[PDB]
């Protein structure tokens, strides 16, 4: 979830959810993030329209 919050933070400020941006945010949070957790998230977020998911949240 720490990974997910990092992603949505990026999205909320208009920054691309990629491996590098995710890593920096997480390290600023004071954690050493697992790299495989980071790429799994980026991959899963592919094809996912975050805004449409957010707004049409059933």
């Amino acid at each position: 979830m720490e990974y997910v919050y990092a992603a949505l933070l990026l999205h909320s400020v208009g920054k691309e959810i990629n491996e590098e941006n995710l890593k920096a945010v997480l390290q600023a949070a004071g954690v050493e993030p697992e790299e495989a957790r980071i790429k799994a998230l980026v991959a899963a977020l592919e094809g996912v329209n975050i805004d449409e998911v957010i707004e049409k949240a059933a």
Binding site: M1, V4, I54
Partner: protein, 211 residues
């Protein structure tokens, strides 16, 4: 004193001073009321800070009081002197909106009900028509609640944190993150159960293809 007049500027004189004495001046239709019911209405109006006067052309003379001061309540620069046949003049300290409601709700005096219809009400430079005075109380209540909800929704949605909004803001951000993670099939302690549910239902549906 009713053996005779009816005197002009004894009746209109008295009505003159009267109009100048009260902040709120209404014309009302009294024609529907028998003499005793009207008498009961007069008593009620007196107990509530005002009084009623009946006359005909000498009533028109809202003009002499308007003239004797500074306004636009009369014949002159007014609208369409809302006077009708058997209009009376009711002078009061009651707010025009309160007066209107009061008259509507006090048809007193077997389940037959009759009362005074307001034609128009003057206060401090303005003439209020019945359409203005007839408040839709539920509309105001609905609008108040709508405006409150607009403020609540805006503050939550932009994450402007207040005691009223902070918990809803936290829950929204969390739900946003959880919902995105489940939709992406991303495994966390918080998402695994909904994800397994999706995967289980997919299994169930897929199995339906078997004969």
């Amino acid at each position: 004193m009713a053996h005779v007049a009816e005197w002009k500027k004894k009746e209109v004189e008295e009505l003159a001073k009267l109009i100048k004495s009260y902040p709120v001046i209404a014309l009302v239709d009294v024609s529907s009321m028998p003499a005793y019911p009207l008498s009961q209405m007069r008593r009620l109006i007196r107990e509530n800070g005002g009084l009623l006067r009946v006359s005909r052309n000498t009533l028109i003379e809202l003009a002499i009081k308007k003239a004797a001061k500074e306004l636009g309540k009369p014949e002159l620069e007014k609208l369409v002197e809302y006077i009708d046949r058997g209009a009376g003049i009711l002078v009061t300290n009651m707010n025009p909106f309160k007066l209107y409601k009061f008259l509507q709700q006090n048809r007193q005096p077997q389940p037959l009900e009759v009362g005074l219809d307001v034609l128009a009400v003057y206060e401090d430079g303005i003439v209020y028509t019945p359409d203005v005075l007839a408040i839709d109380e539920q509309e105001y209540i609905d609008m108040l609640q709508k405006a409150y909800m607009h403020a609540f929704n805006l503050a939550v949605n932009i994450a402007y944190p207040t005691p009223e909004t902070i918990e809803a803001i936290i829950q929204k951000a969390f739900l946003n993150a959880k919902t995105v993670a489940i939709e992406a099939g991303y495994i966390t302690k918080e998402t695994i159960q909904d994800i397994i549910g999706r995967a289980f239902r997919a299994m169930l549906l897929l199995a339906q293809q078997l004969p």
